[PDB]
Amino acid sequence: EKENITDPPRGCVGNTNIWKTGPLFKRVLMSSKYADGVTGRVEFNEDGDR
């Protein structure tokens, strides 16, 4: 749903340039709020825990 999708390239062959949207996708994982779940309402906290 967000814009300017970047992909982590083949870093194992000649690529040492880092994937710059690491913390961006991490922020996507931080704001991931849910209510459905068999184990229960799973939601990441400020440290990424249940």
């Binding site: 913390p23 961006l24 922020r27 931080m30 400020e46």
Partner: protein, 50 residues
Amino acid sequence: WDMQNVITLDTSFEDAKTQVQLKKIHSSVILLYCSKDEAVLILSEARSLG
């Protein structure tokens, strides 16, 4: 030491609340603790915001 309160960056910049944290800065010496590319981003935003 006239220490202004610690500005904390949790994720990549939203430019909504982090811009307010840059507007809270009014001191002289800025002590920055991040990576190199994040320092480039913060200095580019600081030059963009004067």
